[PDB]
Amino acid sequence: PQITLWQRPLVTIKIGGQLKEALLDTGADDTVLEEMSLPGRWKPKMIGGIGGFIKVRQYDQILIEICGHKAIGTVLVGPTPVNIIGRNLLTQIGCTLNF
Amino acid sequence: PQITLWQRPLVTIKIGGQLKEALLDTGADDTVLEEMSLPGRWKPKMIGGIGGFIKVRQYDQILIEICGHKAIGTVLVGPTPVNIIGRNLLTQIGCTLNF
Numbered sequence: 447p448q449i450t451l452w453q454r455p456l457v458t459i460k461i462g463g464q465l466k467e468a469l470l471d472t473g474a475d476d477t478v479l480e481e482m483s484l485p486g487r488w489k490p491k492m493i494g495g496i497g498g499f500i501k502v503r504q505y506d507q508i509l510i511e512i513c514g515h516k517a518i519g520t521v522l523v524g525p526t527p528v529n530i531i532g533r534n535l536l537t538q539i540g541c542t543l544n545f
Numbered sequence: 546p547q548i549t550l551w552q553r554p555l556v557t558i559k560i561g562g563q564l565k566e567a568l569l570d571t572g573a574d575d576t577v578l579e580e581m582s583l584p585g586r587w588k589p590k591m592i593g594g595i596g597g598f599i600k601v602r603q604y605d606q607i608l609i610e611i612c613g614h615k616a617i618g619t620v621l622v623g624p625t626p627v628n629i630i631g632r633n634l635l636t637q638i639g640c641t642l643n644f
């Protein structure tokens with residue numbers, strides 16, 4: 447679809463069987479979701495932006511469905527205030543910025 | 546143009562007669578630039594990222610050119626990790642997310 451930026455670009459995603467709302471964030475290199483249980487081994491990682499860094503757990507090869515589009519990629523899980531879909535997954539769904 | 550997300554969506558912007566690199570960021574409600582001098586009075590504003598909130602200075606009616614597109618809007622200045630062009634200016638240049 448064509449998403450305007452008058453409002454926050456929130457989309458419904460499906461991961462681990464759970465439906466969540468997430469922000470399409472072109473400035474985010476990675477995808478970070480609020481605390482949740484994901485299967486598999488994970489690696490600790492530190493990601494930061496405005497306000498500083500947070501410790502997250504990195505899960506690789508996670509299948510996510512973004513607005514009906516399946517994508518596979520690394521997902522970070524941690525105390526983020528908002529679920530963020532970063533570039534690692536937006537590329538997979540063929541998302542582009544147009545103007 | 547159509548910008549893919551395989552690499553960070555960095556564009557050249559011109560503000561205060563200088564060229565700087567900024568990130569086209571759909572996850573940011575506002576535009577925040579690294580420390581710099583802008584004209585006029587500023588108001589205080591708190592903006593939050595994944596790690597918390599930071600205090601920034603808000604300047605209104607600032608002319609900024611984003612990829613040859615002139616926009617005039619609110620610009621925030623503060624300890625941001627990178628120059629971020631947010632939704633307030635992205636809507637001004639008619640930027641949309643597509644997939």
Ligand SMILES: O=S1(=O)N(Cc2ccccc2)[C@H](COc2ccccc2)[C@H](O)[C@@H](O)[C@@H](COc2ccccc2)N1Cc1ccccc1
Pocket residue numbers: 469471472473474475476477478493494495496497527528530532568570571572573574575576577592593594595596626627629631
């Ligand atoms: O957390 S963020 O700060 N984020 C960081 C991030 C890094 C790695 C993975 C995921 C996220 C970047 C910015 O950080 C960097 C740092 C270095 C390179 C690139 C991006 C993001 O794209 C922005 O969009 C801002 C929102 O900035 C704002 C500016 C003005 C007003 C409001 C917000 N945040 C995301 C965010 C959005 C909404 C709520 C909470 C958090």
